[PDB]
Amino acid sequence: LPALKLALEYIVPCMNKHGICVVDDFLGKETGQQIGDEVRALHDTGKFTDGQLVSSKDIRGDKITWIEGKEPGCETIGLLMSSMDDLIRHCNGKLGSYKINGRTKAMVACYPGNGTGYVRHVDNPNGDGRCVTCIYYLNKDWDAKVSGGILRIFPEGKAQFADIEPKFDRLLFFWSDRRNPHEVQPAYATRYAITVWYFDADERARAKVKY
Ligand SMILES: O=C(O)CNC(=O)c1ncc2c(I)cccc2c1O
Ligand SMILES: [Fe+2]
């Protein structure tokens, strides 16, 4: 579905209402599978880290690697990034009062599927400039009931919580600040995700006064 259409008709209305927005079958099967393969290639080649230390012979969790998008063998990933930027672009000045002028590189995360997950947290608690978190999942035929790895977010100050499964070709958007505390439940199977954070012009500008 047309980026502009999707953005104007779904992402914007949805984001400003729930602060969270899930979009299924974003790029498509062939493309999704393509991204999946490149990601896996990076894993095989050994571009990921050993994983966040969880503990002699300790247990490591999520492994990461930063992808600019033009690295050899990451064309489709670079394509997802550009496609993500396109969506945001159409949401120009539509998401909150924010004015997105930039983003970080892509963070590819891999929970090895050895029980590790990720503690409840807030992506941007100190106002480093990130206003929107964007995550793309590439796990074909994922079954949380079997492999776990659910992403649990606690939107706003509302009771209860929303559960988002790292479904294949799924794209997710959510406020990065205190409004969206979240955690990644233990994953008993390889779980890949690609994350990109979008910067708000003003918040980022005044944050620069730190380096
Ligand atoms: O994978 C998901 O669905 C959700 N991930 C996260 O919230 C998440 N948030 C922050 C993270 C950092 I600073 C570093 C690695 C992984 C990571 C994460 O994976
Ligand atoms: Fe996070």
Coordinates of N, CA and C and ligand atoms in Angstrom, one line a residue:
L1 N 0.9 -1.2 0.0 CA 0.0 0.0 0.0 C 0.9 1.3 0.0
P2 N 0.6 2.2 -0.9 CA 1.3 3.5 -1.0 C 1.8 4.1 0.3
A3 N 3.1 4.4 0.4 CA 3.7 5.0 1.6 C 2.9 6.2 2.0
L4 N 2.6 7.1 1.1 CA 1.9 8.3 1.4 C 0.5 7.9 1.9
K5 N -0.2 7.0 1.2 CA -1.5 6.6 1.6 C -1.5 6.1 3.0
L6 N -0.6 5.1 3.2 CA -0.5 4.4 4.5 C -0.2 5.4 5.6
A7 N 0.8 6.3 5.3 CA 1.2 7.3 6.3 C 0.0 8.2 6.7
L8 N -0.5 8.9 5.7 CA -1.6 9.8 5.9 C -2.8 9.2 6.5
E9 N -3.2 8.1 5.9 CA -4.4 7.4 6.4 C -4.3 6.4 7.6
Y10 N -3.1 6.0 7.9 CA -3.0 5.1 9.0 C -2.0 5.4 10.1
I11 N -0.7 5.5 9.8 CA 0.4 5.8 10.7 C 0.1 7.1 11.5
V12 N -0.2 8.2 10.8 CA -0.5 9.5 11.5 C -1.7 9.5 12.4
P13 N -2.8 9.1 11.9 CA -4.0 9.0 12.7 C -3.8 8.1 13.9
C14 N -3.2 6.9 13.7 CA -2.9 5.9 14.7 C -1.9 6.4 15.7
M15 N -0.8 6.9 15.2 CA 0.3 7.4 16.2 C -0.2 8.4 17.1
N16 N -0.9 9.5 16.6 CA -1.4 10.5 17.5 C -2.5 10.1 18.4
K17 N -2.9 8.9 18.3 CA -4.1 8.4 19.1 C -3.6 7.4 20.1
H18 N -2.8 6.5 19.8 CA -2.3 5.4 20.7 C -0.8 5.5 20.9
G19 N -0.1 6.4 20.2 CA 1.3 6.5 20.3 C 2.0 5.2 19.9
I20 N 1.2 4.3 19.3 CA 1.7 3.0 18.8 C 1.0 2.7 17.5
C21 N 1.7 2.1 16.6 CA 1.1 1.8 15.3 C 1.7 0.6 14.7
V22 N 1.0 -0.4 14.5 CA 1.5 -1.7 13.9 C 1.0 -1.8 12.4
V23 N 2.0 -2.1 11.5 CA 1.6 -2.2 10.1 C 2.1 -3.5 9.6
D24 N 1.2 -4.4 9.2 CA 1.6 -5.7 8.7 C 1.9 -5.8 7.2
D25 N 2.7 -6.8 6.8 CA 3.0 -6.9 5.4 C 3.5 -5.6 4.8
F26 N 4.5 -5.0 5.4 CA 5.0 -3.7 5.0 C 5.7 -3.7 3.6
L27 N 6.7 -4.5 3.5 CA 7.4 -4.5 2.2 C 7.0 -5.7 1.3
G28 N 6.5 -6.7 1.9 CA 6.1 -7.9 1.1 C 6.9 -9.1 1.3
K29 N 6.4 -10.3 1.0 CA 7.0 -11.5 1.2 C 8.4 -11.6 0.5
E30 N 8.5 -11.5 -0.8 CA 9.8 -11.6 -1.5 C 10.8 -10.6 -0.8
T31 N 10.4 -9.4 -0.6 CA 11.3 -8.4 0.0 C 11.7 -8.8 1.4
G32 N 10.6 -9.1 2.2 CA 10.9 -9.5 3.6 C 11.9 -10.6 3.7
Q33 N 11.7 -11.7 2.9 CA 12.6 -12.8 2.9 C 13.9 -12.3 2.5
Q34 N 14.0 -11.4 1.6 CA 15.3 -10.8 1.1 C 16.0 -10.2 2.3
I35 N 15.3 -9.3 3.0 CA 15.9 -8.6 4.2 C 16.4 -9.7 5.1
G36 N 15.5 -10.7 5.4 CA 15.8 -11.8 6.3 C 17.1 -12.5 5.9
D37 N 17.3 -12.8 4.6 CA 18.5 -13.4 4.2 C 19.8 -12.6 4.4
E38 N 19.7 -11.3 4.1 CA 20.9 -10.4 4.4 C 21.2 -10.3 5.8
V39 N 20.2 -10.2 6.7 CA 20.4 -10.1 8.1 C 21.1 -11.4 8.6
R40 N 20.6 -12.5 8.2 CA 21.2 -13.9 8.5 C 22.6 -13.9 7.9
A41 N 22.8 -13.3 6.8 CA 24.2 -13.4 6.2 C 25.1 -12.6 7.1
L42 N 24.7 -11.5 7.6 CA 25.5 -10.7 8.6 C 25.8 -11.5 9.8
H43 N 24.8 -12.3 10.2 CA 25.0 -13.2 11.4 C 26.0 -14.2 11.1
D44 N 25.9 -14.9 10.0 CA 26.8 -15.9 9.6 C 28.2 -15.4 9.4
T45 N 28.3 -14.2 8.7 CA 29.6 -13.6 8.5 C 30.3 -13.2 9.8
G46 N 29.5 -12.9 10.8 CA 30.0 -12.5 12.1 C 30.1 -11.0 12.3
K47 N 29.1 -10.3 11.8 CA 29.1 -8.8 12.0 C 28.4 -8.4 13.3
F48 N 27.7 -9.3 13.9 CA 27.0 -9.0 15.2 C 28.0 -9.1 16.3
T49 N 27.6 -8.6 17.5 CA 28.5 -8.7 18.6 C 28.2 -10.0 19.2
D50 N 28.8 -10.4 20.4 CA 28.6 -11.7 21.0 C 27.3 -11.6 21.8
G51 N 26.8 -10.4 22.0 CA 25.6 -10.3 22.8 C 25.8 -9.6 24.1
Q52 N 24.7 -8.9 24.6 CA 24.7 -8.2 25.8 C 25.0 -9.1 27.0
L53 N 26.0 -8.8 27.8 CA 26.3 -9.7 28.9 C 25.2 -9.8 29.9
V54 N 24.7 -11.0 30.1 CA 23.6 -11.2 31.1 C 24.1 -11.6 32.5
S55 N 25.3 -12.2 32.5 CA 25.9 -12.6 33.8 C 27.0 -11.7 34.2
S56 N 32.6 -17.1 35.0 CA 33.3 -18.0 34.1 C 32.2 -18.6 33.2
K57 N 32.4 -18.5 31.9 CA 31.4 -18.9 30.9 C 30.0 -18.3 31.1
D58 N 29.9 -17.0 30.9 CA 28.6 -16.3 31.2 C 27.6 -16.5 30.0
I59 N 26.5 -15.9 30.2 CA 25.4 -16.0 29.2 C 25.1 -14.7 28.6
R60 N 25.2 -14.6 27.3 CA 25.0 -13.4 26.6 C 23.7 -13.3 25.8
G61 N 23.1 -12.1 25.8 CA 21.8 -12.0 25.1 C 21.8 -11.4 23.8
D62 N 21.0 -10.4 23.6 CA 20.9 -9.7 22.3 C 22.2 -9.3 21.7
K63 N 22.4 -9.6 20.4 CA 23.6 -9.2 19.7 C 23.2 -8.1 18.7
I64 N 24.1 -7.2 18.4 CA 23.7 -6.1 17.6 C 24.8 -5.8 16.5
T65 N 24.4 -5.0 15.5 CA 25.3 -4.6 14.5 C 24.7 -3.3 14.0
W66 N 25.5 -2.2 13.7 CA 24.9 -1.0 13.1 C 25.0 -1.1 11.6
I67 N 23.9 -0.8 10.9 CA 23.9 -0.8 9.4 C 23.5 0.5 8.9
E68 N 24.5 1.2 8.1 CA 24.2 2.5 7.5 C 23.2 2.3 6.4
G69 N 23.3 1.2 5.7 CA 22.4 1.0 4.6 C 23.0 0.8 3.2
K70 N 24.3 1.2 3.1 CA 25.0 1.1 1.9 C 26.2 0.1 2.0
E71 N 26.2 -0.7 3.0 CA 27.2 -1.7 3.2 C 27.0 -2.8 2.2
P72 N 28.0 -3.3 1.6 CA 27.9 -4.4 0.6 C 27.2 -5.6 1.2
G73 N 26.0 -6.0 0.7 CA 25.3 -7.1 1.2 C 24.1 -6.7 2.0
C74 N 23.9 -5.4 2.1 CA 22.8 -4.9 2.9 C 21.9 -4.0 2.1
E75 N 21.8 -4.3 0.8 CA 21.0 -3.5 -0.1 C 19.5 -3.4 0.3
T76 N 18.9 -4.6 0.5 CA 17.5 -4.6 0.9 C 17.3 -3.9 2.2
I77 N 18.2 -4.1 3.1 CA 18.1 -3.5 4.5 C 18.2 -2.0 4.2
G78 N 19.1 -1.6 3.3 CA 19.3 -0.2 3.0 C 18.0 0.3 2.4
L79 N 17.3 -0.7 1.7 CA 16.1 -0.3 1.0 C 15.0 -0.2 2.0
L80 N 15.0 -1.0 3.1 CA 14.0 -0.9 4.2 C 14.1 0.4 4.9
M81 N 15.4 0.8 5.1 CA 15.7 2.1 5.8 C 15.1 3.2 5.0
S82 N 15.4 3.2 3.7 CA 14.9 4.3 2.8 C 13.4 4.3 2.7
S83 N 12.8 3.1 2.8 CA 11.4 3.0 2.8 C 10.8 3.5 4.0
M84 N 11.6 3.3 5.1 CA 11.1 3.8 6.4 C 11.1 5.3 6.4
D85 N 12.2 5.8 5.9 CA 12.4 7.3 5.8 C 11.3 7.9 4.9
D86 N 10.9 7.2 3.9 CA 9.9 7.7 3.0 C 8.6 7.8 3.8
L87 N 8.2 6.8 4.5 CA 7.0 6.9 5.3 C 7.0 8.1 6.2
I88 N 8.1 8.2 7.0 CA 8.2 9.3 8.0 C 8.0 10.6 7.2
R89 N 8.7 10.7 6.1 CA 8.8 11.8 5.2 C 7.4 12.3 4.9
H90 N 6.5 11.4 4.5 CA 5.1 11.7 4.2 C 4.4 12.1 5.5
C91 N 4.8 11.7 6.6 CA 4.2 12.1 7.9 C 4.7 13.4 8.3
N92 N 5.4 14.1 7.4 CA 6.0 15.4 7.6 C 5.1 16.3 8.5
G93 N 5.6 16.7 9.7 CA 4.9 17.5 10.6 C 3.5 17.0 11.0
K94 N 3.3 15.7 10.7 CA 2.0 15.1 11.0 C 2.0 14.5 12.4
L95 N 3.2 13.9 12.8 CA 3.3 13.2 14.1 C 3.6 14.2 15.1
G96 N 2.7 14.4 16.1 CA 2.8 15.4 17.1 C 3.2 16.7 16.6
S97 N 3.9 17.5 17.4 CA 4.3 18.9 17.0 C 5.7 18.7 16.5
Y98 N 6.2 17.5 16.6 CA 7.6 17.2 16.2 C 7.9 17.5 14.8
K99 N 9.2 17.8 14.5 CA 9.6 18.1 13.1 C 10.9 17.2 12.9
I100 N 10.7 16.0 12.4 CA 11.7 15.0 12.2 C 12.8 15.4 11.2
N101 N 14.0 15.8 11.6 CA 15.0 16.2 10.6 C 16.1 15.2 10.4
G102 N 16.1 14.1 11.2 CA 17.1 13.1 11.0 C 16.7 11.8 11.7
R103 N 17.7 10.9 11.7 CA 17.5 9.5 12.3 C 18.9 8.9 12.5
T104 N 18.9 7.8 13.3 CA 20.1 7.1 13.5 C 20.3 6.1 12.4
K105 N 21.4 5.4 12.5 CA 21.7 4.3 11.5 C 20.7 3.2 12.0
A106 N 20.7 2.1 11.2 CA 19.8 1.0 11.6 C 20.5 0.0 12.6
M107 N 19.8 -0.3 13.7 CA 20.3 -1.2 14.6 C 19.6 -2.6 14.4
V108 N 20.4 -3.6 14.0 CA 19.9 -4.9 13.8 C 20.1 -5.7 15.0
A109 N 19.1 -6.2 15.6 CA 19.2 -6.9 16.8 C 18.9 -8.3 16.6
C110 N 19.6 -9.2 17.3 CA 19.4 -10.7 17.2 C 19.3 -11.3 18.6
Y111 N 18.2 -11.7 19.1 CA 18.1 -12.5 20.4 C 18.4 -13.9 19.9
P112 N 19.5 -14.5 20.2 CA 20.0 -15.8 19.8 C 19.0 -17.0 20.1
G113 N 17.9 -16.6 20.9 CA 16.9 -17.7 21.1 C 17.4 -18.6 22.2
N114 N 18.2 -18.1 23.1 CA 18.6 -18.9 24.2 C 18.0 -18.5 25.5
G115 N 16.8 -18.1 25.5 CA 16.1 -17.7 26.8 C 16.2 -16.2 27.1
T116 N 17.3 -15.5 26.6 CA 17.5 -14.1 26.9 C 16.4 -13.2 26.3
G117 N 16.2 -12.1 27.0 CA 15.2 -11.1 26.5 C 15.8 -9.8 26.7
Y118 N 15.0 -8.8 27.1 CA 15.6 -7.5 27.3 C 14.8 -6.8 28.4
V119 N 15.5 -6.3 29.5 CA 14.8 -5.7 30.6 C 13.9 -4.6 30.2
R120 N 12.8 -4.4 31.0 CA 11.9 -3.3 30.8 C 12.7 -2.0 30.7
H121 N 12.4 -1.1 29.8 CA 13.2 0.1 29.6 C 12.4 1.2 28.8
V122 N 13.1 2.3 28.7 CA 12.5 3.5 28.0 C 13.7 3.8 27.0
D123 N 13.4 3.8 25.8 CA 14.4 4.1 24.8 C 15.1 5.4 25.0
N124 N 14.3 6.5 25.2 CA 14.9 7.8 25.4 C 14.3 8.5 26.6
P125 N 14.9 8.3 27.8 CA 14.4 8.9 29.1 C 15.0 10.2 29.3
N126 N 16.2 10.5 28.9 CA 16.8 11.8 29.1 C 16.7 12.8 28.0
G127 N 15.8 12.7 27.1 CA 15.7 13.7 26.0 C 16.9 13.8 25.1
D128 N 17.4 12.7 24.6 CA 18.6 12.8 23.7 C 18.1 13.1 22.3
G129 N 16.9 13.4 22.1 CA 16.4 13.8 20.7 C 15.5 12.8 20.0
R130 N 15.5 11.5 20.3 CA 14.7 10.5 19.7 C 13.3 10.7 20.1
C131 N 12.4 10.9 19.1 CA 11.0 11.0 19.4 C 10.2 9.8 18.9
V132 N 10.7 9.1 17.9 CA 9.9 8.0 17.4 C 10.8 6.7 17.1
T133 N 10.4 5.6 17.7 CA 11.0 4.3 17.5 C 10.4 3.5 16.4
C134 N 11.2 3.0 15.5 CA 10.6 2.3 14.3 C 11.3 0.9 14.3
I135 N 10.5 -0.1 14.3 CA 11.1 -1.4 14.3 C 10.5 -2.3 13.2
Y136 N 11.3 -3.0 12.5 CA 10.9 -3.9 11.5 C 11.3 -5.4 11.9
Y137 N 10.3 -6.3 11.9 CA 10.5 -7.7 12.2 C 10.6 -8.6 11.0
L138 N 11.5 -9.6 11.0 CA 11.6 -10.4 9.8 C 11.7 -11.9 10.2
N139 N 10.8 -12.3 11.1 CA 10.8 -13.7 11.6 C 9.7 -14.5 11.0
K140 N 9.9 -15.2 9.9 CA 8.9 -16.0 9.2 C 8.2 -17.0 10.1
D141 N 6.9 -17.1 10.0 CA 6.1 -18.0 10.8 C 6.6 -18.1 12.3
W142 N 6.5 -17.0 12.9 CA 6.8 -16.9 14.3 C 5.7 -17.2 15.2
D143 N 5.9 -18.0 16.3 CA 4.9 -18.4 17.2 C 5.4 -18.1 18.6
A144 N 4.9 -17.0 19.2 CA 5.2 -16.6 20.5 C 5.0 -17.7 21.5
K145 N 3.8 -18.4 21.4 CA 3.4 -19.4 22.3 C 4.5 -20.5 22.3
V146 N 5.3 -20.6 21.2 CA 6.3 -21.6 21.2 C 7.7 -21.0 21.3
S147 N 8.0 -19.9 20.6 CA 9.3 -19.4 20.7 C 9.4 -18.1 21.6
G148 N 8.3 -17.7 22.1 CA 8.2 -16.5 23.0 C 8.7 -15.2 22.2
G149 N 9.4 -14.4 22.9 CA 10.0 -13.2 22.3 C 9.0 -12.0 22.0
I150 N 7.9 -12.0 22.8 CA 7.0 -10.9 22.6 C 7.5 -9.6 23.1
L151 N 7.1 -8.5 22.5 CA 7.5 -7.2 22.9 C 6.3 -6.6 23.7
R152 N 6.5 -6.3 24.9 CA 5.4 -5.8 25.7 C 5.7 -4.3 26.1
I153 N 4.7 -3.5 25.6 CA 4.8 -2.1 25.9 C 3.7 -1.7 26.8
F154 N 4.0 -0.7 27.7 CA 3.0 -0.2 28.6 C 2.7 1.3 28.3
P155 N 2.0 1.5 27.2 CA 1.6 2.8 26.7 C 1.1 3.8 27.7
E156 N 1.6 5.0 27.7 CA 1.2 6.1 28.6 C 1.3 5.7 30.0
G157 N 0.2 6.1 30.8 CA 0.1 5.7 32.2 C -1.1 4.8 32.4
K158 N -1.6 4.3 31.2 CA -2.7 3.4 31.2 C -2.4 2.1 31.8
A159 N -3.5 1.5 32.5 CA -3.3 0.2 33.1 C -3.2 -0.8 32.0
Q160 N -2.9 -2.1 32.3 CA -2.8 -3.1 31.3 C -1.6 -2.8 30.4
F161 N -1.5 -3.6 29.3 CA -0.4 -3.4 28.3 C -0.7 -4.0 27.0
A162 N 0.1 -3.6 26.0 CA -0.1 -4.1 24.6 C 1.0 -5.1 24.3
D163 N 0.6 -6.2 23.7 CA 1.6 -7.2 23.3 C 1.8 -7.2 21.7
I164 N 3.0 -7.0 21.3 CA 3.3 -7.0 19.9 C 4.3 -8.2 19.5
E165 N 3.9 -9.0 18.6 CA 4.7 -10.2 18.3 C 5.6 -9.8 17.1
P166 N 6.8 -10.3 17.2 CA 7.8 -10.0 16.2 C 7.5 -10.7 14.9
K167 N 6.3 -10.5 14.4 CA 5.8 -11.2 13.1 C 6.6 -10.8 11.9
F168 N 6.7 -11.7 11.0 CA 7.4 -11.5 9.7 C 6.9 -10.3 9.0
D169 N 7.8 -9.5 8.4 CA 7.4 -8.3 7.6 C 6.5 -7.3 8.4
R170 N 6.6 -7.3 9.7 CA 5.8 -6.4 10.5 C 6.6 -5.1 10.7
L171 N 6.0 -3.9 10.7 CA 6.7 -2.7 11.0 C 6.0 -2.0 12.2
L172 N 6.7 -1.5 13.1 CA 6.1 -0.9 14.3 C 6.6 0.5 14.5
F173 N 5.8 1.4 15.1 CA 6.1 2.8 15.4 C 5.6 3.0 16.8
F174 N 6.4 3.7 17.6 CA 6.0 4.1 18.9 C 6.8 5.2 19.6
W175 N 6.2 6.1 20.4 CA 7.0 7.2 21.0 C 8.1 6.6 21.8
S176 N 9.3 7.2 21.7 CA 10.5 6.7 22.3 C 10.7 7.1 23.8
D177 N 10.0 8.1 24.2 CA 10.2 8.7 25.6 C 9.5 7.9 26.6
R178 N 9.4 8.4 27.8 CA 8.7 7.8 29.0 C 7.3 7.2 28.7
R179 N 6.7 7.7 27.7 CA 5.3 7.3 27.4 C 5.2 5.8 26.9
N180 N 6.4 5.2 26.6 CA 6.4 3.8 26.1 C 7.4 2.9 26.7
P181 N 7.3 2.6 28.0 CA 8.3 1.7 28.7 C 8.0 0.3 28.1
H182 N 9.1 -0.5 27.8 CA 8.8 -1.8 27.2 C 9.9 -2.8 27.5
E183 N 9.6 -4.1 27.2 CA 10.6 -5.1 27.4 C 10.4 -6.2 26.4
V184 N 11.5 -6.9 26.1 CA 11.4 -8.0 25.2 C 11.5 -9.4 26.0
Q185 N 10.3 -10.1 26.0 CA 10.2 -11.4 26.8 C 11.2 -12.4 26.2
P186 N 11.7 -13.3 27.0 CA 12.7 -14.3 26.6 C 12.3 -14.9 25.2
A187 N 13.3 -15.1 24.4 CA 13.1 -15.7 23.1 C 13.9 -17.1 23.0
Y188 N 13.1 -18.1 22.7 CA 13.7 -19.4 22.7 C 14.0 -19.8 21.2
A189 N 13.9 -18.9 20.3 CA 14.3 -19.1 18.9 C 15.0 -17.8 18.4
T190 N 15.7 -17.9 17.3 CA 16.4 -16.8 16.8 C 15.3 -15.8 16.4
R191 N 15.5 -14.5 17.0 CA 14.6 -13.5 16.8 C 15.3 -12.2 16.2
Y192 N 15.0 -11.9 15.0 CA 15.7 -10.7 14.4 C 14.8 -9.5 14.3
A193 N 15.4 -8.3 14.6 CA 14.6 -7.1 14.5 C 15.5 -6.0 14.0
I194 N 15.0 -5.0 13.3 CA 15.7 -3.9 12.8 C 15.1 -2.6 13.3
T195 N 15.9 -1.8 14.0 CA 15.3 -0.6 14.6 C 16.0 0.7 14.1
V196 N 15.2 1.7 14.0 CA 15.7 3.0 13.6 C 14.9 4.0 14.4
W197 N 15.7 5.0 15.0 CA 15.1 6.1 15.8 C 15.1 7.4 15.0
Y198 N 14.0 8.1 15.1 CA 13.9 9.4 14.4 C 14.0 10.5 15.4
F199 N 14.8 11.5 15.0 CA 15.1 12.7 15.8 C 14.1 13.8 15.6
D200 N 13.7 14.5 16.7 CA 12.9 15.7 16.6 C 14.0 16.9 16.5
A201 N 13.8 17.8 15.6 CA 14.7 18.9 15.4 C 15.1 19.7 16.6
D202 N 14.1 20.1 17.4 CA 14.4 20.9 18.5 C 15.0 20.2 19.7
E203 N 14.4 19.0 20.0 CA 14.9 18.2 21.1 C 16.3 17.9 20.9
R204 N 16.7 17.5 19.7 CA 18.0 17.1 19.4 C 19.0 18.3 19.4
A205 N 18.5 19.4 19.0 CA 19.3 20.6 18.9 C 19.8 21.0 20.4
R206 N 18.8 21.0 21.3 CA 19.2 21.4 22.6 C 20.0 20.3 23.3
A207 N 19.8 19.1 22.8 CA 20.6 18.0 23.4 C 22.1 18.1 23.1
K208 N 22.4 18.6 21.9 CA 23.8 18.7 21.4 C 24.6 19.3 22.5
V209 N 24.1 20.2 23.3 CA 24.8 20.8 24.4 C 25.2 19.8 25.5
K210 N 26.0 18.8 25.1 CA 26.4 17.7 26.0 C 27.8 17.2 25.5
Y211 N 28.0 17.1 24.2 CA 29.2 16.6 23.7 C 30.3 17.7 23.8
Ligands
LIG1 O1 13.1 -6.1 19.6 C1 12.0 -5.5 20.0 O2 10.9 -5.8 19.6 C2 12.1 -4.4 21.0 N1 13.5 -4.0 21.3 C3 13.7 -3.0 22.2 O3 12.9 -2.4 22.8 C4 15.2 -2.6 22.3 N2 15.5 -1.4 22.9 C5 16.7 -1.0 23.1 C6 17.8 -1.7 22.7 C7 19.1 -1.3 22.8 I1 19.5 0.6 23.7 C8 20.2 -2.1 22.4 C9 19.9 -3.3 21.8 C10 18.6 -3.8 21.7 C11 17.6 -3.0 22.1 C12 16.2 -3.4 21.9 O4 16.0 -4.6 21.3
FE2 FE 13.7 -0.5 23.4

